[PDB]
Copies of this chain bind each other. A is one copy, B any other.
Amino acid sequence: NAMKQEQMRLANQLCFSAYNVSRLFAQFYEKKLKQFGITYSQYLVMLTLWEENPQTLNSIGRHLDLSSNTLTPMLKRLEQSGWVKRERQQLIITLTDNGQQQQEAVFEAISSCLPQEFDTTEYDETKYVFEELEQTLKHLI
């Protein structure tokens, strides 16, 4: 009874906190991604591409958990800006040379705003918590 409650109450709190953290991440990067003319969600797409290039449209959606319908207009906008290329094989998405070159400039603008104060281990703890939550959520999905 009272133990069940506390559990549900906690799950509720983590769901709102996870939403909060993600929103705060979007607000923080937005201010420095403005100058490159991309939005946070497009940055995340780029981010997965610099990890693994090329990818299919479905590989990208799986990595970000986005429907094919939400990705298309973002990719079309990235192609118009010159960051990726789209080709119908199902779509394959590849990095343009320019979108590869941008990675250094973009990272530059972000890592200047980072806190001087940081440490591997506080980061590893937080990564862990997010990784354990993500892992459990997909297991049910």
Given A25-B18, A65-B20, A125-B129, A137:B110 Cβ within 8 A: no
- Shortest distance from the beta carbon of A85 to any chain B beta carbon, whole Å: 19
Given A50-B5, A51-B5, A103-B1, A10:B137 Cβ within 8 A: no
Check: A115 CB closer than 8 A to any chain B CB: yes
Partner of A130, one of B14, B104, B123, B136: B14
Q: Which of A123-141 contact B (CB under 8 A)?
A: 123, 125-127, 129-141
Contact between B136 and A114, CB atoms less than 8 A apart: yes
A47 — which chain B residues lie within 8 A by C-beta? Answer: 5, 8-9, 12, 16
* Number of copies of chain A assembled together: 2
Given A24-B65, A25-B15, A130-B14, A8:B140 Cβ within 8 A: no
Check: A91 CB closer than 8 A to any chain B CB: no
Main DSSP-derived SS at the A contact region: helix
Tell me the complex Cα distance, A114–B27, Å: 27
The 10 closest A-B pairs by CB, nearest first: A24-B137, A22-B22, A17-B130, A15-B25, A4-B107, A115-B132, A8-B111, A18-B22, A10-B123, A115-B136
